[PDB]
Copies of this chain bind each other. A is one copy, B any other.
Amino acid sequence: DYLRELYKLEQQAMKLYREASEKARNPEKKSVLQKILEDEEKHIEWLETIN
């Protein structure tokens, strides 16, 4: 349950951060968003790492 809802939310985050990073024009902002996006992708990977 918890893990699945977390996975769902991480997927939502990846989608939103990708879109946001693509809409951003200020390179510093784009960079911050891409950095967070990488983190969420990492979380997704980490969640797929269980038992």
Contact = CB atoms under 8 A, between A and B. Distances in A.
Interface of A: 2-3, 5-6, 9-10, 12-13, 16-17, 19-20, 23, 26, 28-29, 32-33, 35-36, 39, 43, 46-47, 49-50
A27 to B, nearest CB: 11
Contacts of A35: 46
Contacts of A28: 50
Oligomeric state, in copies = 2
25 contacts: A2-B16, A2-B19, A2-B20, A2-B23, A5-B16, A6-B13, A6-B16, A6-B20, A9-B9, A9-B12, A9-B13, A10-B13, A13-B13, A28-B50, A29-B50, A32-B46, A32-B47, A32-B49, A32-B50, A35-B46, A36-B43, A36-B46, A36-B47, A39-B39, A39-B43
